[model samples]
Target: AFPQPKSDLSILLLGAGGREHALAFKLAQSSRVARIVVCPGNGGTALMGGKVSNLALPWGAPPAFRSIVEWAQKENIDLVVPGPEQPLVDGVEGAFKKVGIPVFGPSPAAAMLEGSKSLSKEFMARHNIPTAAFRSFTSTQYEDAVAYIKSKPFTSGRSVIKASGLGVLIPETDEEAFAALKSVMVDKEFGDAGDEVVVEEYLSGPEISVLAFSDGYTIVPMPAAQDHKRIGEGDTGLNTGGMGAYAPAPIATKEIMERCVKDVLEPTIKGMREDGYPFVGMLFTGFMITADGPRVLEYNVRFGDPETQALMLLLDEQTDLAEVLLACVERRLDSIKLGYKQGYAVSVVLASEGYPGSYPKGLPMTLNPTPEGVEVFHAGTKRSDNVTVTDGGRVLAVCASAPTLRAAVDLAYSGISQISFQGQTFRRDIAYRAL
Candidate 1:
């Protein structure tokens, strides 16, 4: 076990997205934190100006794990928190842990819950977790996969076939299903994510995101946050990382959270421990609140993007984000009680013109001074010649927390209006379902 820090903690946070910026912002609020270094962080973090600074460590395509560990050790980093899944999947936790530094992420062995759809499907089936009935096929099983799809009598009338890519195809006919299979196995449309395909029954209903803290032994759930993944209003468009998000989703009623805890969250943590893959850090569960019940859609090992932006504001006003994560790292989450502020929070993403596709980067950007109660978390941005310029597909996130959902949504949009860049785009209905 790691020794609890006796003094203020210096932290190294990896990844460069709105999620990292929001996390940096919240962690700065902790009096116990000496400073936070966000490696390859975005424009927002660069300008945060106090107890927070961005470190330019250009991660290789697969990330430079050895160098990162070296930097953390050289800087005496007390904690390592990764904001994205790639590094964790590539073994960031093991890299840091071997050097006696605590990382707030699951080990690569446990990360397969997100890294491999086929493995996660098998895990869920074995654990009796409620999820859509699914069948996974490797790239070599084309003929048998097609046969399996054809033989099934479609009662729900929709079969969801997905390659590793986020692009899911709900084919209504056997012909479409075969095309879906070909696109994944034969054509390799989605890259390696398609090397194995999951053909699942389509579960209808609103989706929910529940992120929690775990030390591989205890689970402490956060207030549910809902994301808008579609790129257009009315929840229609290609799925981007996430368009926007709101916290304390109305659909995750009291009864629902209780059920999710007993049926999904609890079993997941216990099962992982039983399987010798002790999961630590954030467990992001994407759920479908179907007519039958809440069924697991997917699992992410780290924080959700826009969801983190909103959830940060809704955190208990007095809670220290760093201390809670430390509790998890130290295996004392059972003694912690997570609380939320008495309000709602909303985050609206401001993306590039052709985001989730192709888009221009390095365009100059401008913003009005944000009003109190609102935060503009930078996603893909950088400081060039002292001017903030666009650097990625999704540019920024305008987040706000208020006493009510309507007010939070309005405040977020109001903040969004104060910023401008060439070809800036965003969805107008962030929390429309809740409203």
Candidate 2:
């Protein structure tokens, strides 16, 4: 089922998450694609048939991962796409480039934007980008953070605590604040990520996620999207990678999008290159739209989970995703025009009942035939005894596209009903505000 090379390009994608599933799903639709190879991909990609393949291998170890480079060279892979953040931060792109394998992602140094929140926040301060007023501290400064937390806004529960890896905790009281601080920093709960923490005033507003493609020179954005990061309903409980998402968020209107571009996106690309770390792939920026304007929350440096699933639906059919990615890695992104479909797209994630905590794996899952507009993107799933079963925290992402936000939400949920797994959980209020 190699499809006899309808087009000459063969693509190799990295990672084993829902985002990679979405990337593979979209890539599968490309007529220019002759074959797709996914390294350590999930069951969904495996089920995509002979036109695509899933090769299991650890991505960060050199020459070990170079197995892909060797195979790519032998197979004539046209491009290498890294999905998750780890390999990108580990310099897989640089590895491939040294072997003449074109990779789509920022260099390791440029990827530091997402690698270290402390550094990224410093980057923002230096560029005069509007972010929260903040102070970064190490475990050695625990006493100082305690003192700082007892004062003014922090004492009033007006602040948020974050581990250096961007592990955010919004505490409602002094007790809760210290508890979070102790868990992340003192108790080593978040491990090395908690060695340092940044406590900043919690900016109150709806959050928006915006992604843009950068070619180290020019920048272009995608439809505004919102990710439901909380594991429970109404954004309560702990945070997981992401539970659900939708694109073209009404809350992030055209004016707001324009502001985000001028305020954050432009300066970021400018500063990255000016700092000698030229970025050359997707720049995922999450924002908190405050009364003053959108303030930077975090930078992911790759297309985010669940969010990628939804945005894929909003992409116009005429747009050749493969070509767009090629233009990006080749520094000709500015030469191509990316297109988007009208209206909204929604994605709902189904997770294990104990997700964001300890959870079971290998539970059997079944799919009821979906309606016309839905696409199911598998995250943590695999075939067991010839039946699909869960493999991780977030199991599958159900996505849909429609002419309106409400319709998209409805369509996505309808598709979810067609899926079943024991103890599956998801937020019922996804895109509740926009509709």
Candidate 3:
């Protein structure tokens, strides 16, 4: 069903993940929104009926983007919000802008901060932003890269090799290092992304994720959140997309948050502006709270998965998410004053038994009535014949909010108990660091 006729805007959202579902959930509550259309949304967004619906649009292709733009024009879309980085890096925002439509994302030129690991490292070094020492190499330097990794002794006694796309591996020996480099530069395991590689010193510390809204000038940060990136409990095992998350990270105290804004966020937004491309959307900064102080881990151009699921619940009741995004697009983000609820939020991911590796899909899923203050965001699910089924590795995220982080974590787990699917895997200890 559509919203009331008097509503002022029709919003177009793109993506099919838990982050997109959380965004759609928040956008629907905007008073000015008449309707929201999500392209290739997941099971959660599919069930979000009134004022929200899903469309089957091809993603990650230029021709498909053209089709999306034409369709948006015909449907009278007032705003476009992409939930993933690929679309922004592919210049979807620019496509919409050429036709006079507003987009709440950075231009492709600006998106390189996230799209290219080498450029981001260079950018950080040039702008004097705090980050780990790093070196980047191309495929042609395979032999030299292997020799370099073998000869170099990192300060931390460890190092990380990244394929610029999604492959991140920590190598402890010369053989391991060579194999990693070979996979990235020779084997071409990550396709074009493997053409270049980044090797950086490994830093160990409690990590926190901070998201901010920027219109290239004014930067407003959301409450800090922490994500469990590893698949196993206690942050062991291989790294998957993300396992669970909680917001209002107790570690990001007032002093640290202030430092983050002044030292990291300010220099970043200012640097982007000086670089000629003005960022105009969300910036997800991953930080490692090392003994030396906060150091940037990486940058994401869009919202984090389970992190967003929890973060959305902390939004102040009177705040309008859509208006804030529109303000960013219009370069009036400074006019928006973002407020958070007085509480904590937690989210736990339910994944396939074998995930971050090969796993089965299309299994029947059962969901029971949720406990009060809990909401489930679908990550890899689809609705079929009035039933929800797993469609990917990470299936869904059960989230909750409460006066205390403990209560929020407990409530999220309580909601999880009511949900069932064969081979469902989840961490028993979420927010363990905070507790």
Candidate 4:
């Protein structure tokens, strides 16, 4: 077995989204952790019992990562768990490790898997990883890009235009492709993110997110979750970050899981390890379960959002989440045995008005006392004047787990009934197709 922690532990958690909130929720239950501090955490994390507290930091670069490192050292924190991708992409793990503090994430050099989509595409090709065929181009190749899209070699004479580095969009027709092309390349629709673009063939099917903890040499897969990316009901309208999610997706059956491990995960570990950039944290595998097979959609270096919230519901009180994470960083993940409760979990996101675009904030939020089997996790919420209020696009995620997938989905929606906000927008069909 991996090294066990003493009954008391102190941890510093970074990030303020639902991912952080779910992680905080689980860690607060561990007897090994005595104190849980969330830097710039949300309203949910703020209420993680006496052992958990929020650590506020100044906005912008005023305090700097150095000061944050100093604070962790002074607090005698046993581990630092970063929730979001930006800090990891900026190499926050290296900063903590240089000071002899254990960080449960990959170093900056290994984070390119999530930071640069263009580089990720190249890496996938070099390692014989299964992904969509594509062509990436920088601004200097703008004319070539226009001609390439015009040539229509991609499926259906249309291409899926991505930011090359981040963000994704699908242009319906040739005209739509031109508009999207101009929107990204000419008008700078996505800012510097659009400076380079990747126009690729479109793949079809339901998507599944398989997140695993890696110990450089081994990977432990968690129950699969499917995300609802649209902003409106019936999977219509523009894509917001994610409206809701459900776990143990039927698409990830036993045979499919075996293929993913053999075809994607194992090769990935060997590929990254041989290249001298051993990834030692969470590995997010986004795949499209197409008519042919599962095709890679993207790779995230950190834990995903609402998916993490649903998975958190699966963590029983007996599980030591903090230790599992430590084992990953300690290069001994194989030593740990993970067991899940018998059930399915689902999460439904509540957003503010005009989300995935412009929207107002400070809408008063309220929740009646919740019963068992439900968790209301704050994402874009803040305690303004000690009142919970909407503060960002995704306001909150109500997570619930039950003996059946249908029961879990129903539980999540019922939990949403207890909460109210001025512009509270949520999808009624979270896992509709699966149900």
RMSD of each: 2.0, 3.4, 2.9, 2.2
Q: Give the alpha carbon lDDT tens digit for every residue of 1-435 in model 2.
A: 655533768898988888988998888888888788888898888888867889876554742357777777788888999888877877777788877888889887888888788889999999999999888889888998888888754423477888886367888777888889889878978888888898888778889999998888889899999989888787888878899999888888889999999989999999998898889889999999988899999898999888999998878988888988988988898898689989899999999979888999999998889889899999999876778999999999989999988988999899988999999998999988676
How far in Å is the alpha carbon of 185 misplaced in model 4? 3.6
Task: Compose the digit string of candidate 3's lDDT tens values, residues 59-144.
Answer: 53762487889889889899999888888887888889888889898888887778888888888999999999889899899988
Residue 235 Cα positional deviation in candidate 2, in Å, after optimal superposition: 2.8
**Candidate 3 lDDT (Cα, whole model)?**
0.89
- Candidate 3, superposed: residue stretches over 4 Å from native: 1-6
Give residue 214's lDDT in candidate 4 (0 to 100): 94
Stronger candidate by TM-score (2 vs 4): 4
Q: Score candidate 4 by TM-score against the native.
A: 0.95
lDDT of 1 by residue, 85-174 (tens): 888888888888788999899997998899887889889999999999888888899998888887884568678887753357888677
TM-score of each: 0.96, 0.92, 0.96, 0.95
What's model 2's overall lDDT?
0.86
Off by over 4 Å in 2: 1-7, 60-64, 67-74, 150-157, 175-179
Q: Which residue pairs come into collision in candidate 2?
A: none
Error of 3 at 228 (Å): 0.5
Candidate 4 residue spans exceeding 4 A from truth: 1-4, 59-64
User: Can you write out model 4's per-residue Cα lDDT over 147-201, one digit (the tens) per residue?
Assistant: 9887878664657888865468787787888788878888888888887888888
Structure candidate 1, residue pairs in collision: 164-193
Model 1 spans with C-alpha error above 4 angstroms: 1-5, 60-64, 164-167
Q: What does the lDDT read for residue 63 in candidate 2?
A: 27
